[PDB]
């Protein structure tokens, strides 16, 4: 139920969802379903 433009893998480093939108093609540090 999240954006179909999502590329899903976890950032094992700081604890981030690198969730990459292959529309413009950019990796978000972020979690859209959370805050941290």
């Amino acid at each position: 139920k999240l954006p179909p433009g999502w590329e899903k893998r976890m950032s094992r480093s700081s604890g981030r969802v690198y969730y990459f939108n292959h529309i413009t093609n950019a990796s978000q540090w972020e979690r859209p379903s959370g805050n941290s």
């Binding site: 590329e7 893998r9 950032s11 094992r12 690198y18 990459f20 540090w29």
Partner: peptide, 8 residues
């Protein structure tokens, strides 16, 4: 390929 951002 997109995986594992930390340095950026």
């Amino acid at each position: 390929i997109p995986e594992t951002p930390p340095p950026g």
